[PDB]
Every structure is written in structure tokens, then in C-alpha cells.
Amino acid sequence: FDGGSRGKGEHFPYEQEIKFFAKVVLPLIDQYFKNHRLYFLSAASRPL
């Protein structure tokens, strides 16, 4: 869609899918990694 968007195809075929991205995946990433800040930092090396 780097080429589709500047082309004739403005009626975006996958609008629901990219809305799912921009309204679920990004905020779930945000909240997941704010709750589990140091979990992925923790490696049984004494973080957490």
C-alpha cells in the first residue's frame, strides 16, 4: 500500500484489518508491556 495509496485505489480493501492493527494491536502492546515492564527484562538473573 506504499504504492496502492498513491495510486487510484483509495477505497482501501483492508480497512477493517488495519483498524484492527491501529486500535487493538498497538494498544495491547502498550498495556501488555506497561504491566509487564521488567518481565521481558527478567531472565532469572534477579530482575523480578
Side-chain angles (χ1 to χ4, degrees):
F1 266 111
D2 283 93
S5 46
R6 293 100 169 167
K8 65 181 289 294
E10 309 297 328
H11 63 45
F12 185 77
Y14 292 159
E15 191 270 335
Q16 185 271 330
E17 283 77 4
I18 75 160
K19 297 288 95 176
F20 191 67
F21 181 76
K23 300 293 178 66
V24 175
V25 168
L26 285 168
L28 67 82
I29 285 188
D30 284 323
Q31 188 53 258
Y32 194 56
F33 297 137
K34 299 289 94 176
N35 276 350
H36 301 116
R37 290 289 85 193
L38 189 136
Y39 164 68
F40 293 113
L41 290 171
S42 63
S45 297
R46 295 296 87 193
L48 288 178

